[PDB]
Amino acid sequence: LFDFDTELLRDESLWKACKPTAVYEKDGDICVTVPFQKQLLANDMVADTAVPREEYTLIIRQYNIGITRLFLGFGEYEILFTQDGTKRAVINVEEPALDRWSELLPDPQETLDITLYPDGKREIRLAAYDHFSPPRYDGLPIAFCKRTGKKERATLSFESRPDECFAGTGERFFKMDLSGQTLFLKNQDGQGVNNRRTYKNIPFYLSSRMYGTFYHTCAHSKLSLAGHSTRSVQFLSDQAMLDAFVIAGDTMEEILRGYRDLTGYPSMPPLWSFGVWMSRMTYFSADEVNEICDRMRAEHYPCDVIHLDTGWFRTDWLCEWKFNEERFPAGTIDFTYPKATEWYKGLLKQLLDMGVTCIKTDFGENIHMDAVYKGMKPELLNNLYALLYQKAAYEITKEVTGDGIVWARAAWAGCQRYPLHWGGDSCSSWDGMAGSLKGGLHFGLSGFAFWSHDVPGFHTLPNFMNSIVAEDVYMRWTQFGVFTSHIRYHGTNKREPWHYPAIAPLVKKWWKLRYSLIPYIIEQSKLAVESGWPLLQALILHHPEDKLCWHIDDEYYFGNDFLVAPVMNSENRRDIYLPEGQWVNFFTGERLQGGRWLKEVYVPLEEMPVYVRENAVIPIYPEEV
C-alpha cells in the first residue's frame, strides 16, 4: 500500500514509529504523546541509523459521546483516564521478554503500541506487531514517508480479528462485507455500477466489532479493510496528516449517529421530492415535455417531477444555463475562490428564479488537476470538491426555493448534509440492479439518509443508446424503486410507461402505491434527519449479532418497519431470509414464522417480497392524487 519503487530508484524513504519518548497532558485534557520516528534503510526492512530519528506529537482527544480522536500533524498542522476513569487508552510499558535461544533473527525494532477504549468497553488497538521476522512488516501502526525531503503518505493501522466484517466507505458497489478490499479513497466517474471505480468515496468504515472510524482527510487515500494484511485495517493518506475519529457504539445506529455529530446531519427534503421523477438523457423541446406531462395525468400516472438533462441548451451536452431556443419555460470552477462561488451561485440564481426547484449537480469527482486554485493544492481540493460543489448549489437553492435540495452524483465526507444523491449510471440489467443496491447500502452505512438510483438502470447493453430496456427488468426495478428514499426514471432511452405496454398498467398501480406510502416515508425520514438512520438500511442496522446479515446485500429495511427482498431475476424465483421477528407479508398478510430462510419462493411479476412486523402501524394516503 505504501508505494514506492519504480524501479526503486526514487528519492523516497519510510519512517517507522517507535516507543514514545514522552507522554503528557495537555493542556485541554487532551493527552499528547511524542513518539520517535526513525527512517528505514530503503526497503526492506532495516533501520537506517546514519539518519537521526524525528519526533512528532500524537495528541489524543476524548469526546462527550464515546469518540476518541487520534491526531498527528507531523510538521505541519493541528493509561488514560476520563476524569472518572473509565480508561480510554493504554500506551505500552514494554519489556517484551522473552527467553532467548537464538540467534538466527535479531530482536524486532521498537513499535508504537496503543489500545483505545472510546466507550471504555471497545478494544480497538494499533497494529503494532504486524510483522514476520524483523525484515518483513505487512503493517505499520503509525508511519510516514519522505519524497525528496517532502513529507507524505502517513499511515495509520488498527488490528482486526479473522471474522471481522466491514461496511460503508461511501457508495461502494461491493458485497455487504468488505474484508479483503483495499480501497482507493478517491472519487471517480464509475462508468457503470459494477466495478471499483466509485462515484462516492467516504473516509469511513463500520466494524462488526461495533465501532466506526472517520478519517478526517480529503487527500487521496488508501484504505485496506483487511485487504493486504488479513490482520489489519490500514489507512493511507498522501497528505502526511492523520486525524482519526474512533466512534464506539452499542448499535450500529449509534455509530452512524455520532458520525453525523461530527460532520453534519441531513436536512429534510421537501414534500414534492418524494413523488416520482420522470426524466431522460435527453429531452429538448418544451412541447416534447408538455406532451409527456399532459399524458401521464390524462392516463393518471401519479408523477411529481420532470427532469431536464444534457439538452436544454444551444447544443446538448454544452452547459451554460442560458436555456436553448424553446422560448419561455475546458476549465473547472474554483469553489475555493469565495467569489467564483458567488458567480456559480449567480448562474443557479437565474434558473431558480424561473421556477426550477432542484439542480442536478452532476460530476465533481474530477477536477483539472493541472491548474492553480485560490486555495488548497489540487491534490487536496479534488475529493473535498463534492462538498464545496454541492454546498453552493444547496445553499443558493434554499435561499430562493426555501428548500435545501440538490441532485448530486459525487460525494465526500460532509456531503450528507445536502440531500440527495443518486446511484450513478447503472446498467439496465440484474447486475446494475444488485450492484446499485450494494451501493445504497454502504451509502446508508456511510452517514447518508437519502439515496436514489436511475430506474430501471441508466443504460442498456450492448449499445448504450439504442438497445431495449426489457419489461422484465423494468417492473422489478420500479418495485425496488418505490421502496427507496427517492424514485427517478432516467436514462439513455425512453422511460415513459406507455413505451412498455403489458407492464404499463402495473407500473401505474405501483406509482399509486408510492403515493399511498409517502406519509410513511416522510415520518421515517423526519426521524432520519435527526439521527444516524438511513431510509435504505442494511439488515445489520437491526441485526448486528446475526452473522448471516453481515453477508446479505440483496435484502434491506425501508424505513423501520419494512423488509425488502427484491426479485432481481428473469426466472421470477428467489430465496428470502427472514431475520428474527414475527413477519407479515405486506400484500398478502401471511403470518411468517421467524428467523429462517424462504427457499425458492416464486414471486409473480406484479409483486415484490415485502414484510412488516406483526403489529406495526404504517401511514398512508387513502386517496388518489
What does this structure look like?
With 625 residues, this protein is an alpha+beta fold. The protein folds into three domains: 250 residues, no CATH class; 315 residues, TIM Barrel, CATH 3.20.20; 49 residues, Immunoglobulin-like (Sandwich), CATH 2.60.40. It contains eight helices and 34 strands. Strands 1, 2, 3, 4, 5, 10, 11, 12, 13, 14, 15, 16, 17 and 18 form a 14-stranded antiparallel β-sheet that branches. A six-stranded antiparallel β-sheet has the order 27-28-29-34-31-32. A four-stranded antiparallel β-sheet has the order 6-7-8-9, with no helix packed on it. Strand 21, helix 4 and strand 22 form a beta-alpha-beta unit. Helix 3 runs parallel beside helix 4 and helix 6 runs parallel beside helix 7. The radius of gyration is 26 Å and the shape is globular. This is Alpha-glucosidase. GO terms for molecular function: carbohydrate binding; hydrolase activity, hydrolyzing O-glycosyl compounds. Belongs to the glycosyl hydrolase 31 family. Keywords: Glycosidase, Hydrolase.
> And the CATH topology of the largest domain?
TIM Barrel
Radius of gyration: 26 Å
Structural class category: alpha+beta
The proportion of strand residues reads: 15-25%
Number of strands: 34
Distance between the termini: 56 Å
Major beta sheet summary: 14 strands, antiparallel
Number of helices in the DSSP assignment: 8
**Under the CATH scheme, which class of the largest domain?**
Alpha Beta
Q: Assign an overall shape.
A: globular
What's the domain count? 3
The second-level CATH architecture of the largest domain is Alpha-Beta Barrel
CATH superfamily of the largest domain: Glycosidases
Helical residue percent?
10-25%
PDB class: hydrolase
Keywords: Family Glycoside Hydrolase, hydrolase
Assembly: monomeric
Entry title: Crystal structure of Family 31 alpha-glucosidase (BT_0339) from Bacteroides thetaiotaomicron
